[PDB]
Amino acid sequence: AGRTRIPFNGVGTSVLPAYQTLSAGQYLLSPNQRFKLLLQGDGNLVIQDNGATVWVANEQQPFSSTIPLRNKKAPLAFYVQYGAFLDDYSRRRVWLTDNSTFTSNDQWNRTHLVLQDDGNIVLVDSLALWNGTPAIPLVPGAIDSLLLAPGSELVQGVVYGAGASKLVFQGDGNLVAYGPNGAATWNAGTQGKGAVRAVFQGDGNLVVYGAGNAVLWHSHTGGHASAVLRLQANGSIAILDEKPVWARFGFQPTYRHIRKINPDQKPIDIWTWHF
């Protein structure tokens, strides 16, 4: 008793979800569209940079293993089941990633592959604690996403941008995310209720307070100090608890993981590592 895979149907997006079979001809693109992860018909798994191959899945890739594949019926396929696996009979091989040590069996359901805007492919244990906009696709790995760290006040009237989208704690006291076409994709519905403050707290809860620290609205995500709040260029807003467990560069099993930062100390949705 345990999950079976289904065919991937997300060609051109930046994420390969768990237990989904990517087959020949299918590909991911980074959100900025510069990079493409392609499974070729010749059985090579390839990353291309503006159309040119700059990486190939093989034995020379740090923290990956190649073991025999004797099963004759195994179709060419690439998929994620905590670790990533490339079944390539043509070379009698399974190529797979040596992930960081697993902490829970739940990770098998939550871990997906992200093709980032910096060209890295990263396996990320990802849990959406709150998703304000379930109809809008989650798009990890984009340089133009806005991330707020816990402990970030949303100053009233300030427009926080992510490409053409924005998040605003408005003069009328509503907390609103606007999508690329100028329409609201989500709002807390707190206009006219005396809202005085909106804050993504240190405990990972997004809260709008009124007079006397009255709670007018909250995301019910308290107790997650490692969560981030993300506004995407497509208008998606969500609170996520995420950690990487493999990457093709930068990653080492014993290194600590952190998000890259802008020159003004703001975090970016791109994973990196250091001791």
Author numbering: 2 to 276
The authors write:
Putidacin A (or LlpABW), first identified in Pseudomonas putida BW11M1, represents a class of Pseudomonas-specific antibacterial proteins not related to any known bacteriocin. For the protein containing two similarly folded domains, we constructed site-specific mutants affected in carbohydrate binding and domain chimers from LlpA homologues to show that mannose-specific sugar binding mediated by one domain is required for activity and that the other domain determines target strain specificity.
In the case of the pentasaccharide, the central reducing mannose is located in the shallow Me-Man binding site and the two GlcNAcβ(1–2)Man moieties stretch out over the surface making only a few additional hydrogen bonds or van der Waals contacts. Far UV CD spectra of these mutant forms are identical to that of native protein LlpABW, indicating that the mutations do not affect the overall structure of the protein. Isothermal titration calorimetry (ITC) showed that LlpABW has an affinity of 2.1 mM for the pentasaccharide GlcNAcβ(1–2)Manα(1–3)[GlcNAcβ(1–2)Manα(1–6)]Man, the highest among all the tested oligo-mannosides (See Figure 5 and Table 1 for a summary of the experimentally validated LlpABW-carbohydrate interactions).
